[PDB]
Amino acid sequence: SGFRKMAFPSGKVEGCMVQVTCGTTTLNGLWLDDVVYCPRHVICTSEDMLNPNYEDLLIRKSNHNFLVQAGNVQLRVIGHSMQNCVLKLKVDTANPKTPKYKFVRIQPGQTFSVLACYNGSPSGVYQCAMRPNFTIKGSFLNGSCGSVGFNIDYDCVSFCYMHHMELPTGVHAGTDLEGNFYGPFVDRQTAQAAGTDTTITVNVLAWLYAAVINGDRWFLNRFTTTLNDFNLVAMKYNYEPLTQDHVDILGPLSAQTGIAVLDMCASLKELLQNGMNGRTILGSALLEDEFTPFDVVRQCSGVT
Amino acid sequence: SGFRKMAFPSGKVEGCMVQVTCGTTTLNGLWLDDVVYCPRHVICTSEDMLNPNYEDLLIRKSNHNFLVQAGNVQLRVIGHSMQNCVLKLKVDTANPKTPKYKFVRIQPGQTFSVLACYNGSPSGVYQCAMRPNFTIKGSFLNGSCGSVGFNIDYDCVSFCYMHHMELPTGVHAGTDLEGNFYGPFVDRQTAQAAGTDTTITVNVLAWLYAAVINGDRWFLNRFTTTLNDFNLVAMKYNYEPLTQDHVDILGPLSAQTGIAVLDMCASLKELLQNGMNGRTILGSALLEDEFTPFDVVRQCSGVT
Ligand SMILES: *CCC(=O)N(c1ccc(C(C)(C)C)cc1)[C@@H](C(=O)NCC)c1cccnc1
Numbered sequence: 001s002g003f004r005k006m007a008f009p010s011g012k013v014e015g016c017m018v019q020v021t022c023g024t025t026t027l028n029g030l031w032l033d034d035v036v037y038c039p040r041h042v043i044c045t046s047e048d049m050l051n052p053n054y055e056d057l058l059i060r061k062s063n064h065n066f067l068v069q070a071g072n073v074q075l076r077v078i079g080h081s082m083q084n085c086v087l088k089l090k091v092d093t094a095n096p097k098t099p100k101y102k103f104v105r106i107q108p109g110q111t112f113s114v115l116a117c118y119n120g121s122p123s124g125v126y127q128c129a130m131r132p133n134f135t136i137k138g139s140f141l142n143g144s145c146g147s148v149g150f151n152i153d154y155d156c157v158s159f160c161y162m163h164h165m166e167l168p169t170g171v172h173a174g175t176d177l178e179g180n181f182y183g184p185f186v187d188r189q190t191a192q193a194a195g196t197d198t199t200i201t202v203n204v205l206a207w208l209y210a211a212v213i214n215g216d217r218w219f220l221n222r223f224t225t226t227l228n229d230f231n232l233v234a235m236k237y238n239y240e241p242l243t244q245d246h247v248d249i250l251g252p253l254s255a256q257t258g259i260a261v262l263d264m265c266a267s268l269k270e271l272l273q274n275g276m277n278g279r280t281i282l283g284s285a286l287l288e289d290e291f292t293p294f295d296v297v298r299q300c301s302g303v304t
Numbered sequence: 305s306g307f308r309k310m311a312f313p314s315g316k317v318e319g320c321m322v323q324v325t326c327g328t329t330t331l332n333g334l335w336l337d338d339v340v341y342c343p344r345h346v347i348c349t350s351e352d353m354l355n356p357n358y359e360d361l362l363i364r365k366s367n368h369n370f371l372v373q374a375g376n377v378q379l380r381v382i383g384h385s386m387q388n389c390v391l392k393l394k395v396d397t398a399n400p401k402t403p404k405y406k407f408v409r410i411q412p413g414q415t416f417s418v419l420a421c422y423n424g425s426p427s428g429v430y431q432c433a434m435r436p437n438f439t440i441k442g443s444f445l446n447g448s449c450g451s452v453g454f455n456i457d458y459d460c461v462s463f464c465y466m467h468h469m470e471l472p473t474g475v476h477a478g479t480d481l482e483g484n485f486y487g488p489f490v491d492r493q494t495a496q497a498a499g500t501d502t503t504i505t506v507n508v509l510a511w512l513y514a515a516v517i518n519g520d521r522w523f524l525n526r527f528t529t530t531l532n533d534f535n536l537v538a539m540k541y542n543y544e545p546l547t548q549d550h551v552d553i554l555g556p557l558s559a560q561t562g563i564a565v566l567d568m569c570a571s572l573k574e575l576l577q578n579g580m581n582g583r584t585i586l587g588s589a590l591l592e593d594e595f596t597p598f599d600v601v602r603q604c605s606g607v608t
C-alpha cells in the first residue's frame with residue numbers, strides 16, 4: 001500500500017547522457033547508437049538569443065566545433081545536421097550503453113520521468129506530465145537543456161521530451177526527439193505566454209481510484225452523474241472535458257474497485273463544488289492530475 | 305526555476321539489485337562486492353509470521369537453500385550469516401557494477417530515495433523521509449522487501465534503508481544495512497502501532513525558502529518571532545521543536561534570500577494559525593516537510 005509520485009528507474013538513460021559544448025555554450029546531449037542529440041540552441045551566443053537564424057549560425061560551425069564528452073572521454077564528431085530544433089552529431093563510436101529505445105511524441109495529459117542533467121551528469125529524476133497547454137512544470141536550472149523525458153516498457157526506453165527552455169513564467173518548453181516543439185513555443189528569447197493550464201480530468205479520476213485502492217475513501221458519495229452533466233462542472237473549473245475514450249481507459253480501475261466511472265465523476269464533481277474541507281487524499285490537499293490511468297495500474301500492480 | 309520532489313539517479317543502485325529466494329519466499333537483495341544483503345524474513349513460511357524464531361529457522365537452511373539471481377544468471381552462495389534483521393549471503397563473485405558505497409544509519413527528518421523493486425527488478429524511484437516516528441510513507445507492494453533507500457554524494461552511494469514490512473496502518477518499517485530497525489518495530493506479524501507522526505519543522509522552513517527562491521512569496525509577512533514563541537506554536541500543531549542547530553543549518557538559505565530564520569518561522573506560525581486560505585505554495589496546498597535544507601540547496605544549485 002501507499003501511493004507515490006514515482007519515476008522510472010533512470011539507469012538506462014544515465015548511460016546515454018553526454019556533455020555538448022559549442023563555442024562557450026555547454027548543455028546536455030543524448031548519445032544513442034552513433035548519434036548525439038542536443039538542442040540546436042547550443043550554437044547560440046549571448047547575442048543570438050533575441051532572433052537567431054539557426055541556418056546562418058550553423059554555416060559557421062564544423063564537426064570539430066562540437067565538443068562531445070561522455071564521462072571523462074571525448075567523442076569524435078564525424079557529421080552534424082539540424083532536424084527541426086535539434087542537432088544530431090554523428091560520432092565515430094556507438095554508445096555501448098545504448099538501451100532498446102524509441103522516439104515517441106506524447107499527447108498532452110501523458111506523464112513521463114525527467115532525468116535532470118548538468119554538464120552531462122545526472123542530478124536527479126522526477127515524474128512530470130505534459131500539460132494541456134504543452135508546457136511542463138519541471139525543475140530545471142541554466143545548463144539543464146538537453147535533459148530528456150522518457151517512459152520505460154520492460155527494457156525499452158521511449159524518449160518523448162528534450163528540454164529546451166524556460167518561459168518567463170517559470171514553466172518549461174521543449175521538443176520531441178525529432179526536434180519538434182510541443183506547443184507553439186520557439187527556441188528564441190521572446191514573449192511566449194502559455195495558454196490556460198487546465199486540469200487533466202482523466203488523471204484526477206485515476207488518482208481518486210488509486211486513493212480508494214489505498215483506503216482513502218471519505219470522498220465517495222451517494223451520487224452519480226452523466227458525461228454531459230459532469231462536463232458542465234469540468235468547464236466551470238477549467239478541467240479538460242471527459243470523453244467516452246477517457247471512461248473506457250478508466251475501465252480496469254472501475255472494475256477493480258467496483259465504482260462505476262460516472263459515480264467517481266460525481267465524487268469529483270462534489271469535490272470541485274465543495275472543496276476538501278481541510279481534508280487530504282493520498283497525502284495531498286489538492287486534486288492531483290499527474291498520474292495517468294496506466295500509472296495507477298502500474299504502481300498498484302508492481303510492473304517492473 | 306521550478307521545484308520538484310526529486311530523487312537521486314538510480315542507476316548505481318539498479319546494478320546492485322538481485323532476487324533472493326528461500327524455499328517458496330522471494331524478495332529483493334542488494335549485491336555489493338561479494339555479499340548479498342536481504343531481510344532475514346526471506347526464511348519465513350506462512351506459519352512463521354506470528355512469532356518466528358529466526359535462529360531456529362536458520363539452522364534448517366544451508367548455502368544451497370538461498371537462490372540468488374542477478375538478472376538471468378545464478379550466483380553461487382558460499383556462506384550465510386545473520387546480522388540483526390538482515391541476512392548476508394557471501395557469493396563467489398564480486399558484483400562488477402558495485403559502486404563506491406557506505407552504510408549509514410539516518411536520523412529522523414532526513415530524506416532519501418527508494419528504488420522499489422520486485423523479483424530483483426526495479427519498478428520505480430521516489431523520494432522519502434524517515435518520519436519522526438521511524439516509519440516511512442512509501443509505496444510498496446508484496447515482494448518489495450529488500451528494496452533499499454539511499455543518498456548519493458557525487459559517486460558514493462550511502463545506503464540507509466532496507467524495506468522489511470508494512471504496518472497494519474499502511475506505513476512502512478525497515479532497517480539500516482546493519483539490520484537494525486529504525487524505531488521500535490520487529491520483523492514479526494504483530495500489533496505494532498506507530499507513534500505520533502509529527503511534522504519536520506526544519507524541512508518545512510527549508511521548503512518555504514525554496515518557495516521564495518522560486519517566486520512564491522505571498523506567505524511572507526511583516527512579523528518576526530523567537531525560538532521559544534515559535535516552539536509553543538509548533539507543539540500545538542504537532543510540529544517537531546526547532547533548535548538552534550536547525551536555525552544554523554538554515555543559515556545558507558537565510559543568507560541567499562535575505563530572510564532571517566526567525567522571520568521565516570513567523571511566516572510559518574501565521575500559516576499554521578490561519579491556514580492557506582485556498583492558496584498554494586510550490587504547487588502544494590499543504591506545508592511540505594520531505595525536503596531537507598541540504599535538498600533545497602542541492603536542487604536550487606544543480607549538484608550532479
Ligand atoms: C540550456 C540553456 C539555458 O539554460 N537556457 C536557455 C538560454 C537561451 C536559450 C535561447 C538561445 C534559445 C534563447 C534557450 C535556453 C535557459 C532559458 O530558457 N533562458 C531563457 C531563454 C534555461 C533556464 C532554466 C531552465 N531551462 C532553461
Ligand SMILES: *CCC(=O)N(c1ccc(C(C)(C)C)cc1)[C@@H](C(=O)NCC)c1cccnc1
Nearest residue numbers: 345348353444445446447449469470491492493
Ligand atoms: C516481502 C514480504 C512482504 O511483502 N511482506 C511481509 C510479509 C511477512 C513478513 C513477516 C514474516 C516478517 C511477518 C514481513 C513482510 C508484507 C508485509 O509487511 N505484510 C505484513 C506482515 C509487505 C506488504 C507490502 C509492503 N511491504 C511489505
